């Protein structure tokens, strides 16, 4: 009795140190995913803003064509 009660007290205190540790490994991971996904968000953005610069240029180059097709 004296030795099973103090055993539960060990178990609880053992668990608490562990949960606050898991808790640590976990937002270690969501820290690094939230990071990539901020990087990837910027990369894909950069790509699009480029493929839009270019679509705009080719759109002028076809406007030039259409003209030269009388001149």
């Amino acid at each position: 009795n004296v030795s099973s009660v103090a055993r539960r007290e060990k178990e609880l205190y053992d668990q608490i140190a562990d949960l606050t540790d898991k808790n640590g490994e976990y937002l270690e991971r969501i820290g690094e995913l939230e990071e990539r996904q901020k990087n990837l968000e910027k990369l894909e953005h950069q790509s699009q803003v480029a493929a839009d610069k270019h679509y705009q240029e080719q759109a002028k180059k076809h406007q030039e064509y259409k003209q030269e097709q009388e001149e």
């Binding site: 103090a6 205190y13 608490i16 540790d21 937002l27 270690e28 820290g31």
Partner: protein, 125 residues
């Protein structure tokens, strides 16, 4: 209307060294790591510089916690509070017995985590 040097924290240190420039640009966010003995309570580990010119953040590191020191046979272990970093515990024997070992223990940094500054004493006849 901009940001001065960074305030020292009890739980975190920078990741990219502090040369403590006279000021910082409004909006710059600085990267922090956990001090030994601490773990993270929050996903993001930083602090930025707002439009007023002060650093603004949450408390992203809290205390690590030691495990129980073990069952003191025929003695009792007194947890004033918790086993969280730099918390002290005290041990003590039953009336029959006397203490061989240490009477106090501190939760201290022990290489890659937190352990017990002194081990379990024994309660001898």
């Amino acid at each position: 209307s901009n940001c001065g040097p960074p305030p020292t924290l009890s739980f975190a240190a920078p990741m990219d060294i502090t040369l403590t420039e006279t000021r910082f640009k409004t909006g710059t966010t600085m990267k922090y790591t956990c001090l030994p003995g601490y773990v993270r309570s929050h996903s993001t580990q930083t602090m930025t510089c707002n439009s007023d010119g002060e650093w603004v953040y949450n408390t992203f590191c809290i205390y690590k916690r030691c495990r129980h020191p073990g069952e003191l046979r025929n003695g009792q272990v007194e947890i004033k509070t918790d086993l969280s970093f730099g918390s002290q515990i005290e041990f003590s024997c039953s009336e029959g017995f006397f203490l061989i070992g240490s009477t106090t223990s501190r939760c201290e940094v022990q290489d890659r985590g937190v352990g017990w500054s002194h081990p379990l004493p024994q309660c001898e006849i």
